Amino acid sequence: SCIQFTRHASDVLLNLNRLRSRDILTDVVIVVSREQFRAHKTVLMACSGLFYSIFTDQLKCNLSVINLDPEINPEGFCILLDFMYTSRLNLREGNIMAVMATAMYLQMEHVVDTCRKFIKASE
Amino acid sequence: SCIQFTRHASDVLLNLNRLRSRDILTDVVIVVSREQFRAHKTVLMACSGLFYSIFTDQLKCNLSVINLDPEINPEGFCILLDFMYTSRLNLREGNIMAVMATAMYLQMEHVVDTCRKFIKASE
């Protein structure tokens, strides 16, 4: 018999993105080649099958630094990290291949789906 | 020029609630009289003006235990904590006064609004 506040989940996510911008309670640095990205482990796990697996691991759960595969593109990661915290995906002709490969690695199925559909439409 | 995934914020919140149920990466215990509630500081701040103030404080940000005012009802807190993690509010005739007083203390304006409207309709 609950009532539901429609905008609640979006409001929570907006405030989690504000915490990320102010670097408040971030507990991990994701290293992608020469670039570093600070984030909240809980948000990373909630968005990504790869981070969900990493941070449920009894040893990796305590790491403050996670290094991604050297083939991962920093801009592609940046775009996906922004997506995680906002629901908005900056998908462009110039970045779509990098975004799709990063989303496959990060196990972000909905992003992979849409990248596949946008690529199929251009061929 | 971003695209947006409509269900993303709800999916994130569902996974944050799954982490809470499994006690994964919870970093605080909220003590309400004889009861204890484990949560994620980032979610508490994102939902509550009181926790936002508490966890931005340079000393309180590092506490693992937060004790609420002894006048706060544990069930009222439990209902609001569930709301924070689900967008669903279990508002009933038997709990509405406790929920409203807890929401005022926690500074959860949207919950206070609706409690006020449900009370006004019954008088």
Binding site: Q4, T6 | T114
Partner: peptide
């Protein structure tokens, strides 16, 4: 607020 809505009835979900």
């Amino acid at each position: 607020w809505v009835i979900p």
